[PDB]
């Protein structure tokens, strides 16, 4: 063994049970149980009565008549 760099484990295996900038227990997927699927089904999975941003409540009684400003 004509050694050119020295292997050491103490700086890299201690406190490896958590995830941080210096080491992480495991990578993405497998032990991390990450999900990577895609889906569509737009609008109809939710309620169909949806409304725009506005100053009123749902099923309101009136609406301001623009010509009635005179």
């Amino acid at each position: 063994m004509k050694k050119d760099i020295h292997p050491k484990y103490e700086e890299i295996t201690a406190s490896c049970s958590c995830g941080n900038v210096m080491k992480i227990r495991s990578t993405v997927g497998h032990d991390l149980n990450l999900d990577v699927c895609s889906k569509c089904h737009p609008f109809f999975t939710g309620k169909q009565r949806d409304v725009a941003t506005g100053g009123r409540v749902d099923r309101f009684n009136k609406r301001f008549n623009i010509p009635g400003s005179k």
């Binding site: 050694k3 020295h6 497998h30």
Partner: protein, 178 residues
Amino acid sequence: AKLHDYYKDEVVKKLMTEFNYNSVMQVPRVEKITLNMGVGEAIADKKLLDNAAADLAAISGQKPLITKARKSVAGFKIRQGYPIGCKVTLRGERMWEFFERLITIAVPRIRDFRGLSAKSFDGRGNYSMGVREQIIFPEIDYDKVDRVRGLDITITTTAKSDEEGRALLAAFDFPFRK
């Protein structure tokens, strides 16, 4: 190495009964990881081969040493034996410690879709894979902040089936390719 120590203490004792051998000498092990770093076309530049040798000088205490063209189909200036890569053959403690840096400190290098390929095993006890980037092992947590180059892998095992290939070291937290 803790990975091999766990494998002989816990996993080998279970593979004995899962494959129901007559002898304890039949249970599989990794023999060697032989490597290549087959970047190619480097005889026309030399600095690319010196930079690939300087990545391999940081994966293990072992020294980098050239791989060469055998069919040599591209051609440059010299006949046949022009260099293409820088090897480093790892065995025992020098391969088991390297696979223990994977998914502990090399987490940005290894992904779920770049995990162990369960379909790539064969009953001869031979395996190979690519990792497309260099992955180093210094005395502390460190990265050389240089990219461009990548590495390829060659492995021999004592496994007598591709199903025993899927059982060898399979208890570790390294992902599987899908």
